[PDB]
């Protein structure tokens, strides 16, 4: 319901992290997508806390090692997903009220995400 | 069908002008039927048989 909001707020959060890691390691970031519902929004209420629907971390070859996508506004089954290229690792962030934002059921933290990132970055290291 | 809905504003004004017009129409008519000069300019002229109206296409 309003789950939505905290999720969005979480999505920003996560994104923020993605940038941080990006700068931290100096690794390449690229915003991928923006909301359809921003484009074709044109007088109908927009209030999303960012404009960004999809964004990714790339190796420095334009090849991502990590993709990060939010669900759109009215697009049901609202979750945020991650997936590591060539790994078949598909992560489904739910939000759980009374907890926070959970990875399956385990609460996400930044470090979790960093660990995922480093193992990605270093392992797959396509370039 | 048309591409969007009517204005609401359309309704007042539409009534309004229907009120005024009957009277107005009359007053234009009023200029013509009398004015015996109106007669003397118009009546005789503009002739053509109905039959020929179709033949030549009217």
């Amino acid at each position: 319901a309003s789950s939505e909001r905290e999720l969005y707020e979480a999505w920003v959060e996560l994104l923020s992290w993605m940038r941080e890691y990006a700068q931290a390691k100096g690794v390449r970031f690229e915003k991928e997508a923006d909301f359809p519902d921003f484009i074709y929004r044109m007088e109908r209420p927009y209030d999303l806390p960012t404009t960004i629907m999809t964004a990714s971390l790339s190796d420095g070859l334009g090849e991502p090692f990590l993709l990060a996508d939010v669900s759109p506004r009215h697009a049901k089954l609202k979750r945020i997903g991650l997936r590591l290229p060539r790994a078949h690792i598909h992560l489904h962030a739910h939000y759980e009220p009374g907890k926070g934002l959970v990875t399956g059921k385990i609460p996400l933290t930044k470090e979790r995400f960093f660990a995922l990132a480093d193992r990605a970055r270093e392992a797959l290291a396509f370039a | 069908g048309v591409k969007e809905d009517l204005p609401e504003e359309f309704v007042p004004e539409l009534k309004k002008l229907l009120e005024v017009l009957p009277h107005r129409i009359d007053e234009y008519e009023a200029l013509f039927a009398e004015s015996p000069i109106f007669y003397e300019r118009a009546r005789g002229v503009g002739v053509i048989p109905p039959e020929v109206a179709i033949d030549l296409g009217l």
């Binding site: 991928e32 997508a33 090849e63 996508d69 697009a75 049901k76 060539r86 | -």
Partner: protein, 754 residues
């Protein structure tokens, strides 16, 4: 033939054929996505599912296309159930198809889009529409991934067009892609990271979405807006039909034009991307040497100059030396002129020691009916896509049935992922080739040895095992086609020996030349005079130049008139008049295709400023010389062409011109037959078309060379920087240097400049 009834109409159509094609012949249609022209089907799209009676009705809707035909068959396509299903599959397809239409640049060419709207629509007269049943979030995956210096990849475009992956197998038989993860998690990728195949770019056209696009024209124009100008290629001697997509009188994009004579649906990469020089700074106002510098002049000012230049000239002092980029018309006019006013020679830039008028040409379609191909040369470089035509030959395919639409869209005769032969061809290159992938008979020869091979096949020298097996094979090959290089045509003896063998068992020849329209110009007698000289050599003291010649050419002259399209270092201390010349795109005239076929070249609609063809300019030199050539226009030239006895619209022409003027020297530097030409090295292809220097690891070592770097080299054909290639297929004792521009097969002298 097979008795088909598709719904309400019957057709004969011989057996082994796809239902699909008869459908389209019948004027009935279906949505179609997987299978395609010139390619073996798969079932994957599943769009060609119909029901059929023969009279009952199948319990499962077979992909008609995949299935063969049957006599007395009924095909049902107007089925209510079909239409419903079509929509169905459409919806299914659309499930993750990311919304991107306005910025989609598949766009007008989004055939997918068009099928959607054709065949789609909800099952319900409606009083309220429906659009979906879907509503969940889509997949988000990969985009903005540059796949190549020419090609951008945004992955979620793909419909799982399997076409390209398929292409790579079918057409080049060289693979570089693959599906990756399974199920829905899947997606196609490369692990080449930039695909080093010589044919690649066709996939842009094949991509039935906009995943693979020409970045160079990304966000530059829109599909519909372009004028798609069918015209002719000339950039390789195949000179394929092409289509110049243009807006603002500027070349947006080259796409294939699908003549099934000189390609089918196939283009070289060099052809498609190697066009930016045209899109770039080019000569567009006449120049003259002042006293120290070049001066912006008119045509008139030049004509005055021409008279001046021809006031102390006898016309035997004058050299006419053309590019290998001249039309029949310009040829014809040169011919007639050099008659009229004798000059000591006519030549053209790419011209060789022994013509292709020493041999038959052949057809590509001829080459499918063939037995064996004995190959000496390099299809990949010289005649690129012929390489591919051979691949098909080799993969065993017999000529396509062409009907009331030409090509069908399924190969049942051949079926993908399946063998090829090696022993159906013989190969001679002086080094490495991709052909060796399919070759077992392959041989790296020394440069000058080619003749000897020939000699040995005739049996007056002793071959190798390969050459022996070859000997045998040529016997056993009842109608083989002999394929001849640059190293062949430029070396008299080799040519002679070939000439013998190919006569002995009479048989057609495919003559790959570094000249483009070598054969037309040959026919137009643009060959040395009896006293003569070559295009490379000086033979005059004044000159007309359709091209930038050899350095040694420039010395031996004192008035030089160049009709060029750009400036080059060779000119600003050797020029006396430079003039603007039109692109081959925007040139007008007729060319003699390597097949033997005459083709017209459309003028392209492009900006050019001033650039009034060599036709006019050559005419005007003659005007400056007191000689009216009987024509100076296209129109009269067509007449005059026809007069020379050529029937327009792809005549086959025949003539045997025997001149066997020797001219070889033995160098230690090679002119390697290359796939690129100097002026192409601009744009993003700047690097792609830079020079390479190949040498045996041994000689590399011995000269203490860095084998990653680029090295300065000085040749009498210019100073090149060249990446250093180790390659033991090059025997030491020669340096193979990638010859940008025409000219190959030569042993040439230069120096490893330091």
């Amino acid at each position: 033939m097979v008795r088909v009834k598709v719904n309400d109409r019957i057709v004969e159509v011989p057996p082994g054929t796809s239902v699909m094609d008869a459908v389209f012949h019948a004027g009935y249609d279906v949505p179609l996505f997987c299978s395609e022209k010139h390619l073996s089907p798969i079932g994957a799209c599943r769009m060609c599912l119909v029901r059929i009676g023969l009279i009952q009705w199948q319990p499962k809707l077979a992909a008609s296309c995949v299935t063969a035909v049957a006599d007395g068959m009924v095909v049902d396509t107007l089925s209510d159930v079909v239409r419903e299903a079509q929509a169905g599959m459409v919806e299914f397809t659309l499930l993750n198809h990311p919304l991107d239409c306005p910025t989609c640049d598949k766009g007008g060419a989004c055939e997918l889009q068009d099928r959607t709207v054709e065949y789609g629509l909800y099952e319900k007269p409606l009083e309220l529409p429906v659009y979906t049943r879907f509503e969940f979030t889509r997949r988000h995956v990969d985009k903005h991934h540059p796949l190549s210096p020419f090609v951008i990849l945004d992955r979620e475009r793909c419909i799982h067009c399997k076409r390209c992956v398929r292409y790579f197998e079918e057409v080049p038989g060289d693979e570089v892609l693959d599906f990756i993860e399974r199920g829905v998690h899947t997606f196609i990728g490369t692990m080449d990271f930039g695909l080093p195949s010589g044919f690649s770019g066709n996939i842009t056209d094949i991509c039935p979405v906009g995943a693979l696009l020409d970045l160079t024209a990304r966000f530059r124009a829109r599909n519909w807006e372009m004028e798609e100008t069918p015209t002719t290629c000339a950039l390789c001697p195949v000179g394929c039909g092409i289509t110049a997509d243009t807006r603002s009188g500027e070349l947006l994009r080259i796409r294939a034009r699908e003549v099934p004579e000189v390609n089918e649906i196939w283009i070289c990469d060099a052809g498609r991307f190697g066009h930016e020089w045209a899109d770039q700074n080019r000569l567009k106002t006449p120049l003259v040497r002042k006293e120290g510098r070049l001066v912006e002049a008119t045509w008139e000012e030049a004509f005055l100059a021409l008279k001046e230049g021809l006031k102390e000239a006898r016309g035997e002092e004058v050299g006419l030396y053309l590019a290998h980029d001249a039309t029949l018309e310009e040829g014809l006019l040169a011919s007639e002129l050099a008659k009229a006013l004798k000059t000591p020679h006519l030549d053209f830039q790419g011209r060789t020691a022994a013509p292709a008028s020493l041999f038959p040409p052949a057809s590509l379609e001829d080459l499918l009916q063939a037995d064996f191909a004995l190959v000496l040369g390099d299809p990949t470089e010289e005649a690129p896509i012929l390489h591919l035509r051979l691949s098909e030959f080799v993969r065993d395919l017999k000529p396509p049935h062409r009907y009331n639409h030409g090509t069908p869209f399924a190969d049942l005769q051949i079926k993908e992922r399946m063998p090829r032969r090696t022993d159906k061809m013989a190969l001679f290159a002086p080094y490495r080739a991709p052909l060796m992938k399919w070759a077992a008979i392959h041989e790296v020869h020394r440069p000058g040895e080619e003749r000897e091979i020939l000699l040995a096949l005739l049996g007056d020298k002793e071959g190798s095992e390969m050459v022996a097996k070859a000997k045998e094979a040529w016997e056993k090959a009842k109608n083989p086609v002999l394929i001849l290089g640059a190293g062949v045509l430029q070396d008299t003896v080799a040519a002679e020996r070939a000439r013998l063998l190919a006569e002995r068992k009479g048989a057609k020849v495919l003559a790959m030349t570094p000249a483009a329209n070598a054969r037309g110009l040959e026919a137009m007698g643009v060959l040395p005079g009896a006293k003569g000289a070559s295009w490379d050599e000086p033979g005059a003291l004044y000159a007309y130049y359709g091209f930038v010649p050899p350095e040694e050419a420039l010395k031996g002259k004192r008035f030089v008139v160049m009709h060029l399209s750009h400036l080059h270092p060779l000119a600003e201390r050797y020029a006396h008049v430079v003039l603007p010349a039109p692109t081959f795109y925007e040139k007008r005239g007729h060319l003699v295709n390597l097949e033997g076929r005459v083709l017209p070249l459309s003028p392209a609609p492009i900006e050019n400023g001033e650039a009034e063809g060599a036709l006019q300019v050559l005419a005007l030199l003659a005007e400056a010389l007191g000689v009216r050539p009987p024509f100076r226009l296209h129109l009269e030239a067509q007449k005059a062409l026809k007069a020379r006895k050529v029937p327009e619209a792809m005549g086959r022409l025949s003539f045997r011109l025997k001149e066997l003027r020797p001219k070889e020297r033995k160098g230690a530097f090679y002119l390697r037959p290359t796939m690129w030409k100097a002026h192409q090295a601009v744009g993003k292809a700047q690097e792609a078309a830079r020079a390479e220097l190949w040498a045996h690891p041994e000689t590399a070592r011995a000269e203490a060379l860095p084998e990653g770097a680029q090295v300065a080299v000085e040749t009498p054909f210019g100073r090149v920087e060249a990446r250093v290639v180790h390659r033991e297929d090059v025997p030491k004792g020669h340096l193979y240097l990638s010859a940008l521009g025409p000219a190959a097969g030569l042993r040439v002298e230069g120096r490893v400049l330091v």
